[PDB]
Design an enzyme around this catalytic site. Structure first.
Site, mmCIF file in Angstrom:
data_model
loop_
_atom_site.group_PDB
_atom_site.id
_atom_site.type_symbol
_atom_site.label_atom_id
_atom_site.label_comp_id
_atom_site.label_asym_id
_atom_site.label_seq_id
_atom_site.Cartn_x
_atom_site.Cartn_y
_atom_site.Cartn_z
ATOM 1 N N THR A 1 0.783 -1.243 0.000
ATOM 2 C CA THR A 1 0.000 0.000 0.000
ATOM 3 C C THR A 1 0.800 1.270 0.000
ATOM 4 O O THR A 1 0.654 2.083 -0.906
ATOM 5 C CB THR A 1 -0.985 0.049 1.181
ATOM 6 O OG1 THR A 1 -1.795 -1.116 1.103
ATOM 7 C CG2 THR A 1 -1.900 1.210 1.112
ATOM 8 N N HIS B 1 -8.616 -9.054 2.081
ATOM 9 C CA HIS B 1 -7.773 -9.785 3.031
ATOM 10 C C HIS B 1 -8.553 -10.865 3.770
ATOM 11 O O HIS B 1 -8.043 -11.967 3.953
ATOM 12 C CB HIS B 1 -7.182 -8.863 4.069
ATOM 13 C CG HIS B 1 -5.996 -8.150 3.576
ATOM 14 N ND1 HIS B 1 -4.791 -8.785 3.394
ATOM 15 C CD2 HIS B 1 -5.830 -6.880 3.148
ATOM 16 C CE1 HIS B 1 -3.924 -7.931 2.900
ATOM 17 N NE2 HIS B 1 -4.535 -6.777 2.730
ATOM 18 N N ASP C 1 26.610 -2.129 -13.735
ATOM 19 C CA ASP C 1 25.915 -1.463 -12.643
ATOM 20 C C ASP C 1 26.406 -2.053 -11.314
ATOM 21 O O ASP C 1 25.644 -2.637 -10.572
ATOM 22 C CB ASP C 1 24.403 -1.590 -12.778
ATOM 23 C CG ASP C 1 23.641 -0.644 -11.859
ATOM 24 O OD1 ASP C 1 24.218 0.393 -11.431
ATOM 25 O OD2 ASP C 1 22.444 -0.930 -11.564
ATOM 26 N N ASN D 1 27.130 -0.466 -8.543
ATOM 27 C CA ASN D 1 26.541 0.144 -7.351
ATOM 28 C C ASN D 1 24.999 0.005 -7.344
ATOM 29 O O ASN D 1 24.322 0.687 -6.582
ATOM 30 C CB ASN D 1 26.959 1.610 -7.222
ATOM 31 C CG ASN D 1 26.488 2.413 -8.394
ATOM 32 O OD1 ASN D 1 25.938 1.846 -9.352
ATOM 33 N ND2 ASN D 1 26.743 3.698 -8.378
HETATM 34 N N1 YQ0 Z 1 -3.620 -4.703 4.416
HETATM 35 S S1 YQ0 Z 1 -2.631 -3.713 3.601
HETATM 36 O O1 YQ0 Z 1 -3.225 -3.084 2.356
HETATM 37 O O2 YQ0 Z 1 -1.386 -4.465 3.657
HETATM 38 C C1 YQ0 Z 1 -2.734 -2.356 4.957
HETATM 39 F F1 YQ0 Z 1 -2.301 -2.927 6.172
HETATM 40 C C2 YQ0 Z 1 -1.925 -1.033 4.788
HETATM 41 C C3 YQ0 Z 1 -2.352 0.097 5.886
HETATM 42 N N2 YQ0 Z 1 -3.840 0.272 6.155
HETATM 43 C C4 YQ0 Z 1 -4.573 1.453 6.492
HETATM 44 O O3 YQ0 Z 1 -5.498 1.359 7.304
HETATM 45 N N3 YQ0 Z 1 -4.404 2.775 6.032
HETATM 46 C C5 YQ0 Z 1 -3.665 2.929 4.713
HETATM 47 C C6 YQ0 Z 1 -4.079 4.314 4.335
HETATM 48 C C7 YQ0 Z 1 -5.060 4.791 5.086
HETATM 49 C C8 YQ0 Z 1 -5.471 6.173 4.713
HETATM 50 N N4 YQ0 Z 1 -4.430 6.438 3.631
HETATM 51 C C9 YQ0 Z 1 -4.373 7.642 2.983
HETATM 52 O O4 YQ0 Z 1 -5.169 8.517 3.253
HETATM 53 C C10 YQ0 Z 1 -3.344 7.902 1.927
HETATM 54 C C11 YQ0 Z 1 -3.645 8.312 0.652
HETATM 55 C C12 YQ0 Z 1 -2.577 8.620 -0.168
HETATM 56 O O5 YQ0 Z 1 -2.926 8.932 -1.460
HETATM 57 C C13 YQ0 Z 1 -1.844 9.314 -2.320
HETATM 58 C C14 YQ0 Z 1 -2.489 9.650 -3.684
HETATM 59 C C15 YQ0 Z 1 -1.397 10.281 -4.542
HETATM 60 C C16 YQ0 Z 1 -1.996 10.592 -5.921
HETATM 61 O O6 YQ0 Z 1 -2.475 9.383 -6.505
HETATM 62 C C17 YQ0 Z 1 -3.513 8.792 -5.778
HETATM 63 C C18 YQ0 Z 1 -2.998 8.400 -4.366
HETATM 64 N N5 YQ0 Z 1 -1.289 8.548 0.187
HETATM 65 C C19 YQ0 Z 1 -1.041 8.126 1.447
HETATM 66 C C20 YQ0 Z 1 0.382 8.060 1.827
HETATM 67 C C21 YQ0 Z 1 1.418 7.753 0.734
HETATM 68 C C22 YQ0 Z 1 1.376 9.114 1.368
HETATM 69 C C23 YQ0 Z 1 -2.026 7.792 2.342
HETATM 70 C C24 YQ0 Z 1 -3.596 5.259 3.330
HETATM 71 C C25 YQ0 Z 1 -5.466 3.797 6.122
HETATM 72 C C26 YQ0 Z 1 -4.607 -1.013 6.217
HETATM 73 C C27 YQ0 Z 1 -4.288 -1.878 5.000
HETATM 74 CA CA CA Z 2 -3.194 -1.055 -0.435
HETATM 75 CA CA CA Z 3 25.470 2.310 -11.610
HETATM 76 ZN ZN ZN Z 4 -3.863 -4.821 1.860
#
Ligand code: YQ0
Ligand code: CA
Ligand code: CA
Ligand code: ZN
Ligand SMILES: *[C@@H]1O[C@H](CO)[C@@H](O[C@@H]2O[C@H](CO)[C@@H](O[C@@H]3O[C@H](CO[C@H]4O[C@H](CO)[C@@H](O)[C@H](O[C@H]5O[C@H](CO)[C@@H](O)[C@H](O)[C@@H]5O[C@H]5O[C@H](CO)[C@@H](O)[C@H](O)[C@@H]5O)[C@@H]4O)[C@@H](O)[C@H](O[C@H]4O[C@H](CO)[C@@H](O)[C@H](O)[C@@H]4O[C@H]4O[C@H](CO)[C@@H](O)[C@H](O)[C@@H]4O)[C@@H]3O)[C@H](O)[C@H]2NC(C)=O)[C@H](O)[C@H]1NC(C)=O
Ligand code: CL
Ligand code: K
Ligand code: NA
Length: 805
Positions: free
Chosen positions: A159, A265, A683, A685
């Protein structure tokens, strides 16, 4: 410390965040436990739900309601999203036929079409088809706008790495967010999903879109929403911000959905429980579109619907335990799951040896569902090495599996049926892209592309100059009606020399020999013409590559191939040749087995020598133009020139020989001719970028012959395979690879068998974009075609993935 006694009166979802100890009212305050006492009451109202009913129409404005159906609501910017449908006879946006948006149709005072980015966590590409009956709003965006059949995430397909790649245009290695869990040894600090260290700005490299916008005077809505703020309230807040006065109103907005990842999940990607979350996402999309329609913004705003990654079927019983391989399992720290990262539990242990850990994990079980790599040996297409947060030892885990340290980690923590994080080429990890709006095309399908490309487009959509990134700017011009960015080819920096015959045989003391002392005016002018470039139009179909750095090199022409020969590295930078459908494979005659011949165009001092290969017991040699594909017995002598020779471990010559003797011919038969450009890569490094001479860590013993870390080939043909490669009138088709130049075949568990059982599979693993090869060599390919430069850029970013449909 927060003095939480201030108030959110009039500041609900304020755009500028205020500094401790003042209390906060922004869409993140919850997640820092810093909201003012009255934030829920004032900012998170819920009374009466989210939809107008007939009996609310015309009502007296009751400020307690979550949204309003009163007469003043449009002018207040706070109606329920369905207000005009219920109370004013209007239709839902989804029920309206789609009509081409040729120009932005915006209210007065809008300087540019706004951008709204609707991101969906875990939204697997095949949901677009398989869930289509339950997502009518999304399907309308998709079919009326511009869409790809899927979009490729970055590795790891987690994510935060993918959301921050979407934000920056950068590979995780460059942006710093290399997984959902991390250790930074310079900081001596850790980063986790749960907790406070992930909020510290030092984790987050590069320049994300919101900062790019801000610095260039474009105002951004805050992109991040605290988990408890419900979806409906996120939409209404966006819609309210869109009603702000011109000087306060943002130009870019973001909505993020935790679904369908959350349910995937628990239930797996196609669990029956997945239908509902897809319905609910669609309903949210419908609310946004109905709301933009009320504000007369529905033919003004550009809307992106984008996923971070897909979801695969994974259960606890498909777990491999490092305890079934290693005896020393307590002296390691494993970052576990759909990928593996290993380091020493303690940096005071001088008995920790990565070499023995890797060997203990290498081909130990016949069905083994992971493969260990030193990070620099990972397929270069993953771009997953040049960061101190990425551990030296990595495990690439098979799709559908997990890796864990010990069984106790699985039961003391089956729960889950879906996961992601696997190799970004895996079909189940692919995700979605739809663009809808005045700046996107109407009813257009585009080919699959990588998510690293979208930052440039989002900058294009807002009139911003992108910060330096890993996108290839112009490669997605074909998504856009206008706002295209018009790139130009980079300037050649070094021009070649064209050496003629300058040295006599006897001036060379290379220790090479050849059985070639065998002698006619008809065929004497002919070989002269070949050495001056008569067949060059045959073998160099797209112009010579341009050298984009300062160096000294020579173009060498031959009957069957052309090369650019580096006087600095003593080998070709590139070798180009064309193999038609009709061409024949021959063998290396017995008399020429060990033949290497001086090149009378190139001085002894800029030539390799055979003695160094003799004295180097580890290193042998191969040729870039294969002797097997020579056009005539006399032409075959050219293939044994010392200038066509490159250093090759015996283990790698098995790979290379099979590619040259069997695979090139097979590709020519299948694709109706192919043009091949092959060469070395250095490459050391592992930064994905061409090494300078002073970075080379290995030479052929007793010489200045540098050892490549990799060998590439780019194999081009006509997209319309009814035309032969050498007379193609239209678009091209390409596949390429960057093979690791390794002294063993430990990577390939079936390597004691015949090459027909394992070599092609290795090559497929190390498939690559032309663009990856450009970065690694400092060359620029396809300089002279009849195709537009934008189409060429698209071609250069293509990756042949070898997955089925
Ligand atoms: N199970 S899994 O998927 O492995 C999991 F465990 C992973 C964690 N998780 C969460 O509970 N979180 C994760 C998120 C929320 C609310 N969030 C946002 O608010 C958000 C959003 C955004 O948007 C960036 C935009 C940039 C332009 O393009 C579109 C995307 N960036 C970001 C950050 C990069 C800067 C955050 C991430 C709760 C549960 C699920
Ligand atoms: Ca995700
Ligand atoms: Ca290199
Ligand atoms: Zn996930
Ligand atoms: C994908 O696209 C990206 C972005 O375009 C490409 O990455 C760029 O590549 C450039 C070449 O490697 C690189 O340029 C170098 O930057 C040095 C200054 O960098 C700082 O400032 C920038 C600008 O604001 C900033 O973005 C940087 O941020 C990095 O570091 C912090 C952590 O400190 C992270 O928050 C962030 O994520 C990022 O980390 C990533 O990049 C660094 C390298 O910068 C990696 O080490 C990390 O692993 C991680 O991947 C920095 O804050 C600059 O000082 C360099 O100059 C040296 O080399 C030149 C050669 O010309 C020489 O002339 C100079 O003398 C100088 O040498 C001196 O330093 C040496 C090292 O200590 C020393 O040995 C010498 O003796 C000298 O003292 C150089 O210009 C640029 O920073 C990155 N940008 C980013 C964002 O990563 C990437 O290549 C693309 N990938 C592919 C495959 O194409
Ligand atoms: Cl991770
Ligand atoms: K040798
Ligand atoms: Na092997």
């Amino acid at each position: 410390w927060t003095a939480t006694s201030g108030s959110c009166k009039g500041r609900c979802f304020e755009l500028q965040e205020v500094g401790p100890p003042d209390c906060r009212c922004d869409n993140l305050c919850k997640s820092y436990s810093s909201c003012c006492h009255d934030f829920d009451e004032l900012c998170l109202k819920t009374a009466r739900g989210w939809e107008c009913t007939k009996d609310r129409c015309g009502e007296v404005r009751n400020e307690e309601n979550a949204c309003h159906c009163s007469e003043d609501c449009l002018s207040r910017g706070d109606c329920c999203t369905n207000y005009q449908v219920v109370c004013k006879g209007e239709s839902h946006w989804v029920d309206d036929d789609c009509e081409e948006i040729k120009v932005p149709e915006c209210p007065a005072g809008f300087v540019r079409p706004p951008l709204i980015i609707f991101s969906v966590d875990g939204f697997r590409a095949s949901y677009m088809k398989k869930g289509s009956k339950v997502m009518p709003n999304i399907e309308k965006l998709r079919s009326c706008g511009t869409h790809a059949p899927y979009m490729r995430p970055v590795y790891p397909t987690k994510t935060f790495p993918n959301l921050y790649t979407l934000a920056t245009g950068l590979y995780p290695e460059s942006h710093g967010i290399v997984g959902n869990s991390m250790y930074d040894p310079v900081f001596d600090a850790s980063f986790h999903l749960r907790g406070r260290e992930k909020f510290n700005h030092r984790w987050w490299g590069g320049q994300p879109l919101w900062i790019t916008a801000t610095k260039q005077g474009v105002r951004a809505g805050t992109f991040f929403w605290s988990v408890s703020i419900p979806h409906e309230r996120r939409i209404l807040t966006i819609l309210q911000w869109l009603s702000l006065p011109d000087n306060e109103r943002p130009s870019v907005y973001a909505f993020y959905s935790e679904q369908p990842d959350f349910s995937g999940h628990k239930y797996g990607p196609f669990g029956p429980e997945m239908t509902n979350p897809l319905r609910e996402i669609d309903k949210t999309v419908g609310q946004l579109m109905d709301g933009l329609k009320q504000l007369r913004l529905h033919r003004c705003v550009n809307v992106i619907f984008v996923g971070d990654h897909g979801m695969e079927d994974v259960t606890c019983d498909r777990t491999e335990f490092l305890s079934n391989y290693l005896t020393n399992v307590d002296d390691i720290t494993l970052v576990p799951g759909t990928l593996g990262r290993i380091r020493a539990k303690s940096i005071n242990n001088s008995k920790y040896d990565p070499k023995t850990i890797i060997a203990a994990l290498t081909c130990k079980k016949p069905d083994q569902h992971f493969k260990p790599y030193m990070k620099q040996h990972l397929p270069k297409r993953l771009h997953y090495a040049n960061n101190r947060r990425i551990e030296d030892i990595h495990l690439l885990v098979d799709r559908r599996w997990h890796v864990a340290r010990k069984p106790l980690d699985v039961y003391k923590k089956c729960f889950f049926q879906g996961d992601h994080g696997f190799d970004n080429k895996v079909n189940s990890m692919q995700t979605v892209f739809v663009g809808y709006g005045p700046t996107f095309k109407y009813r257009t399908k585009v080919p699959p592309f990588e998510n690293i490309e979208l930052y440039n487009v989002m900058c294009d959509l807002l009139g911003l100059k992108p910060a330096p990134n890993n996108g290839t700017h112009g490669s997605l011009n074909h998504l856009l009606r206008t706002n295209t960015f018009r790139p130009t080819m980079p300037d050649e920096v070094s021009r070649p020399n064209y050496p003629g015959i300058m040295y006599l045989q006897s001036e060379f003391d290379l220790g090479c020999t050849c059985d070639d002392k065998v002698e006619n005016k008809l065929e004497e002018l002919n070989k002269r013409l070949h050495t001056k470039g008569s067949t060059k139009e045959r073998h160099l179909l797209y112009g010579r590559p341009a050298v984009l750095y300062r160096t000294s090199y020579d173009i060498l022409y031959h009957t069957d191939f052309e090369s650019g020969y580096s006087e600095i590295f003593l080998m070709p930078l590139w070798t180009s040749y064309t193999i038609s459908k009709q061409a024949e494979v021959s063998s290396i005659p017995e008399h020429l087995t060990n033949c290497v011949r001086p090149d009378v165009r190139v001085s002894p001092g800029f030539s390799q020598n055979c003695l160094a290969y003799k004295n180097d017991k580890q290193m042998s040699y191969g040729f870039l133009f294969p002797p097997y594909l020579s056009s005539s017995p006399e032409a075959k002598y050219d293939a044994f020139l010392v200038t066509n020779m490159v250093p090759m471990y015996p283990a790698f010559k098995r790979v290379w020989a099979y590619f040259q003797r069997v695979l090139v011919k097979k590709y020519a038969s299948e694709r109706n001719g192919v043009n091949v450009i092959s060469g070395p890569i250095f490459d050391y490094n592992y930064d994905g970028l061409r090494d300078t001479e002073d970075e080379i860590k290995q030479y052929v013993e007793g010489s200045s012959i540098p050892v490549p870390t990799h060998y590439y080939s780019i194999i081009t043909s006509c997209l319309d395979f009814t035309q032969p490669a050498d007379k193609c009138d239209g678009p091209l088709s390409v596949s390429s690879f960057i093979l690791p130049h390794r002294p063993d075949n430990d990577e390939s568990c079936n390597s004691s068998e015949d090459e027909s059982k394992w070599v092609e599979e290795l090559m497929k693993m190390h498939t690559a974009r032309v663009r990856d090869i450009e970065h690694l060599t400092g060359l620029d390919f396809y300089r002279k075609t009849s195709r537009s430069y934008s189409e060429i850029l698209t071609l250069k970013t293509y990756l042949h993935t070898y997955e089925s449909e």
